[PDB]
Scaffold this active site. Sequence first.
Site, short mmCIF file in Angstrom:
data_model
loop_
_atom_site.label_atom_id
_atom_site.label_comp_id
_atom_site.label_asym_id
_atom_site.label_seq_id
_atom_site.Cartn_x
_atom_site.Cartn_y
_atom_site.Cartn_z
N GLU A 79 0.83 -1.19 0.00
CA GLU A 79 0.00 0.00 0.00
C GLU A 79 0.87 1.25 0.00
O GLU A 79 1.69 1.42 0.91
CB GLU A 79 -0.92 0.01 1.21
CG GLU A 79 -1.77 1.26 1.29
CD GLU A 79 -2.71 1.24 2.46
OE1 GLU A 79 -2.77 0.21 3.17
OE2 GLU A 79 -3.40 2.26 2.67
N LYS A 261 -7.56 0.03 11.66
CA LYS A 261 -7.02 -0.48 10.41
C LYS A 261 -5.70 0.21 10.07
O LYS A 261 -4.72 -0.44 9.68
CB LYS A 261 -8.03 -0.30 9.28
CG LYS A 261 -7.70 -1.04 7.99
CD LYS A 261 -6.94 -0.16 7.01
CE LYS A 261 -6.64 -0.91 5.72
NZ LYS A 261 -5.71 -0.17 4.83
N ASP A 277 2.69 -14.34 12.68
CA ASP A 277 1.31 -14.66 12.32
C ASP A 277 0.45 -13.42 12.54
O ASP A 277 0.04 -13.13 13.66
CB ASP A 277 0.82 -15.84 13.16
CG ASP A 277 -0.53 -16.36 12.72
OD1 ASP A 277 -1.32 -15.59 12.13
OD2 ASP A 277 -0.80 -17.54 12.99
N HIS A 376 -1.35 11.92 -0.48
CA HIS A 376 -1.31 10.82 -1.44
C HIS A 376 -0.86 11.27 -2.82
O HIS A 376 -0.39 10.44 -3.60
CB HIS A 376 -2.68 10.16 -1.54
CG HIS A 376 -2.82 8.92 -0.71
ND1 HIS A 376 -3.46 8.92 0.52
CD2 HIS A 376 -2.40 7.65 -0.92
CE1 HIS A 376 -3.42 7.70 1.02
NE2 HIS A 376 -2.79 6.91 0.18
C1 LIG Z 1 3.08 10.56 3.48
C2 LIG Z 1 3.48 11.90 4.10
C3 LIG Z 1 4.66 11.67 5.05
C4 LIG Z 1 3.92 12.86 3.00
O1 LIG Z 1 4.18 14.10 3.59
P1 LIG Z 1 5.37 15.05 2.96
O2 LIG Z 1 5.02 16.50 3.19
O3 LIG Z 1 5.50 14.78 1.48
O4 LIG Z 1 6.80 14.69 3.70
P2 LIG Z 1 8.27 15.14 3.09
O5 LIG Z 1 8.48 14.48 1.75
O6 LIG Z 1 8.31 16.63 2.91
O7 LIG Z 1 9.48 14.67 4.11
C5 LIG Z 1 9.23 14.65 5.49
C6 LIG Z 1 9.66 13.28 6.06
O8 LIG Z 1 8.69 12.41 5.89
C7 LIG Z 1 9.35 11.02 5.36
N1 LIG Z 1 8.98 10.75 3.99
C8 LIG Z 1 8.23 11.63 3.33
N2 LIG Z 1 8.04 11.16 2.09
C9 LIG Z 1 8.69 9.98 1.99
C10 LIG Z 1 8.82 9.08 0.95
N3 LIG Z 1 8.30 9.12 -0.41
N4 LIG Z 1 9.53 7.98 1.12
C11 LIG Z 1 10.12 7.73 2.32
N5 LIG Z 1 9.99 8.61 3.34
C12 LIG Z 1 9.27 9.73 3.16
C13 LIG Z 1 10.64 11.18 5.43
O9 LIG Z 1 11.16 10.70 6.75
C14 LIG Z 1 10.85 12.70 5.27
O10 LIG Z 1 12.05 13.10 5.77
P3 LIG Z 1 13.37 13.14 4.78
O11 LIG Z 1 13.73 11.73 4.35
O12 LIG Z 1 13.08 13.97 3.55
O13 LIG Z 1 14.54 13.74 5.52
C15 LIG Z 1 2.31 12.53 4.86
O14 LIG Z 1 1.41 13.11 3.97
C16 LIG Z 1 1.59 11.50 5.73
O15 LIG Z 1 2.01 11.27 6.82
N6 LIG Z 1 0.41 10.79 5.25
C17 LIG Z 1 -0.26 9.83 6.11
C18 LIG Z 1 -0.54 8.50 5.40
C19 LIG Z 1 -0.80 7.45 6.49
O16 LIG Z 1 -0.78 7.78 7.62
N7 LIG Z 1 -1.05 6.05 6.20
C20 LIG Z 1 -1.09 5.51 4.86
C21 LIG Z 1 -2.23 4.50 4.76
S1 LIG Z 1 -3.73 5.42 4.33
C22 LIG Z 1 -5.15 4.77 5.27
O17 LIG Z 1 -6.13 4.44 4.69
C23 LIG Z 1 -5.07 4.63 6.78
C24 LIG Z 1 -5.99 5.66 7.44
C25 LIG Z 1 -5.47 7.07 7.13
O18 LIG Z 1 -7.29 5.52 6.93
C26 LIG Z 1 -5.98 5.41 8.95
C27 LIG Z 1 -7.04 6.25 9.66
O19 LIG Z 1 -8.03 6.73 9.04
O20 LIG Z 1 -6.92 6.46 10.90
#
Ligand SMILES: CC(C)(COP(=O)([O-])OP(=O)([O-])OC[C@H]1O[C@@H](n2cnc3c(N)ncnc32)[C@H](O)[C@@H]1OP(=O)([O-])[O-])[C@@H](O)C(=O)NCCC(=O)NCCSC(=O)C[C@@](C)(O)CC(=O)[O-]
Lengths: 422, 381
Positions: A79, A261, A277, A376
Amino acid sequence: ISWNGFSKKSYQERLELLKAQALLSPERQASLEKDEQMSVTVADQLSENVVGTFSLPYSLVPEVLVNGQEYTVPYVTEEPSVVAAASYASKIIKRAGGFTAQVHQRQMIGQVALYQVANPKLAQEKIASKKAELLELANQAYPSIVKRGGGARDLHVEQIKGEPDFLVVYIHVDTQEAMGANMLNTMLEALKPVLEELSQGQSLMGILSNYATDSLVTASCRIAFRYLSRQKDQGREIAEKIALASQFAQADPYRAATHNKGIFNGIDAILIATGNDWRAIEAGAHAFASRDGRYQGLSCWTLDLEREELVGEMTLPMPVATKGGSIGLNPRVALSHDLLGNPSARELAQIIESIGLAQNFAALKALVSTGIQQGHMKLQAKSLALLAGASESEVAPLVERLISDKTFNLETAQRYLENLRS
Amino acid sequence: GHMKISWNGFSKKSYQERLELLKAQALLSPERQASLEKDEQMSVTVADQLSENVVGTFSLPYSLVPEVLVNGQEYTVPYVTEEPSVVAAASYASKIIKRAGGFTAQVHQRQMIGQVALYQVANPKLAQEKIASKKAELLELANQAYPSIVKRGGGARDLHVEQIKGEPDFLVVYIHVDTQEAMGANMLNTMLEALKPVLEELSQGQSLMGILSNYATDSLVTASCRIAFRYLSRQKDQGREIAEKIALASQFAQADPYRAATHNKGIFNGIDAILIATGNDWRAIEAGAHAFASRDGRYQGLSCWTLDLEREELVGEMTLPMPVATKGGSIGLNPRVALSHDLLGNPSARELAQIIESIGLAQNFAALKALVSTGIQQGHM
Ligand SMILES: CC(C)(COP(=O)([O-])OP(=O)([O-])OC[C@H]1O[C@@H](n2cnc3c(N)ncnc32)[C@H](O)[C@@H]1OP(=O)([O-])[O-])[C@@H](O)C(=O)NCCC(=O)NCCSC(=O)C[C@@](C)(O)CC(=O)[O-]
Ligand SMILES: CC(C)(COP(=O)([O-])OP(=O)([O-])OC[C@H]1O[C@@H](n2cnc3c(N)ncnc32)[C@H](O)[C@@H]1OP(=O)([O-])[O-])[C@@H](O)C(=O)NCCC(=O)NCCSC(=O)C[C@@](C)(O)CC(=O)[O-]
């Protein structure tokens, strides 16, 4: 060496950075660089009717600080944004001092169901009054190498009402490091004939229970408001909204399900990497989520207004293991344990509990601030910017101009990267 | 029925012989069969697109569960599991239940639920009445930010508001959206985020979040089987006791949450195996189903096994939220996920949900039959 800019590194650059960290032996590093997979002959031994193998991504979540010890966590998820979210949350929480975690207990519960008991009350007290002999019976093949605080430790009988009425005997056994029920089934197989005789009933089943309340593990973080937002005083508002989000998951099961989730997007990722598991963990935790009569969120987020800190906490059954199963057969699972420093079962349980709270934190922070859609379409613009040959210093201005457009492709990032260089 | 090569003795076949038998069945195209024979995996370059910080790929077994008869249509089910005896038990249970006529399954609804939580509402009653009376404009608004789903028969169908009491009080707006073949996460959160500014104005409150809900009660699916006692035991006279004891085992799981957890865990040994094979989100299914198991105030087993003494038949039934998909995600990116859909005849999302619902009850059946008869001591082969 730091993990700064690991976001923007390519696949080959990620492997060089991991090699620079010197976390893996020469053999494991080479195994990872060949991308060594579990063979079909090995998979043929783990499952039945095997006709091939199925591959999933394998990722790293760096800078996971648990009890003052820092880890590089292996993730297996298909994902998008899960690894990025855990990495982002792990970095922030590391700045806030990392996670504090403990293992309350580590015992597995077995149960024997009895039925057709003429008098369950007399049978309950007759079996209870032979608790000592019943546990002594269960301990007779493990007199000292296990009976050093381990072994069958407690036993009790309970009358479970319903249709029909069952007399259930629960045994509590110290699990040790391996995922072997050989301990449990040896004790159960001998107690069943005795429990039938003591109760004058019939035994329905003797089975492990995946509601592992004797294996609870709690992790917590404490994040100053200054770490939540770069803005002035808005870190408190984000903190207030994350605590409100945690209360929403306590009030509405439609939110609790999604809340929990998101927790297991990370928990299952590290459970798969470490060969554990996840069905057992998912079941025990989700049953744990309704222990108070309603299905509610598994983690809590509260405000410490006087210290100006956001507090997160989560307790789950986490009877994970470090030996047995596919751990010794899947070469990437053995590499995952090496990567983590070969932690004990209890140490691994506290790492998994911490990344689940870290995963939950990144989700709530996004939902209550920017939204989860924004985050996203920034990672796509970032990955497309790296496939366009953009350097680290020009990824950010290329993502802003890509995310500005409604739809963008690799050809969109290429044209824009060229204008950035013109 | 003969004149079609059978799966008898498939347990005893070697890896290469299993692929020849599968080839004899002619279920896969020349390209998909060859892809399976080369054991083609998802590449690191493709995995690089599905996740972040990718440094390799992780492999799990890939298996076949044959003779899965659902609604008179027979399937060969793909499993991805690392646990021994899981595939053998699902294959064994499917063969017995196929002899008993197979599974009958239905999809009650197939809609995804999204929610927007509002707080700091001065008058929640008036805000509830204002938002409810503008259902029509709000759902038209929700379909205007995702027009492509409307062009294919889907989109936002219903809306309603609820006052959730507590500390604090929340005003939650739920939207019900037809996703079609997709899981509709991107769809839903796009529609919710567009409703959030308007819902704030209608209530004069503040929006906390607009998010999909994995408690997919608008996507319930039940599957059932009906097994004559003669099929339960080779002795053809012990099937009644086996049936009675499986019904007792099913009621134990209704009475004790310590049993319900294990009972429902055995169900998801198979459900998650086919969810991974078809590239579906098992975390979403696990969360909604396990929340569904406590809908009556206590965590209980998710499937029912009862006795029809007059017909001399064992009846099994299980209702679960199963909002699976056939498009999006890693579907079409993991070449083995596309192969899994082809293997099943490219079923619709609703047809796939009934296969998954049936194999979960088949997995549950094999576990209960063993726990209550021989027991599961090790079962090492
Ligand atoms: C995804 C971010 C971090 C983007 O946010 P961003 O602004 O693009 O972060 P950034 O690119 O500016 O960099 C900040 C730091 O974030 C990390 N980071 C940032 N980008 C990357 C990348 N491509 N690959 C690896 N690491 C990354 C990384 O540590 C980076 O530091 P740096 O390496 O630059 O020194 C933010 O928008 C976010 O936290 N989104 C949350 C998504 C999530 O929490 N879960 C995903 C599953 S979605 C779901 O359905 C679950 C849910 C949400 O429904 C659960 C619920 O409802 O409670
Ligand atoms: C395992 C059997 C079938 C053996 O029992 P058996 O009768 O000795 O096996 P058999 O070889 O005599 O029967 C042959 C047929 O059974 C299947 N089969 C049989 N063996 C194999 C094999 N090696 N590989 C592939 N398929 C196999 C297969 O369909 C085969 O068809 P055939 O090839 O002859 O035409 C039976 O004892 C059984 O069903 N046990 C159930 C075990 C189980 O449920 N495992 C799941 C993981 S454990 C779990 O979920 C935890 C739990 C149970 O606590 C959850 C809960 O409480 O509900």
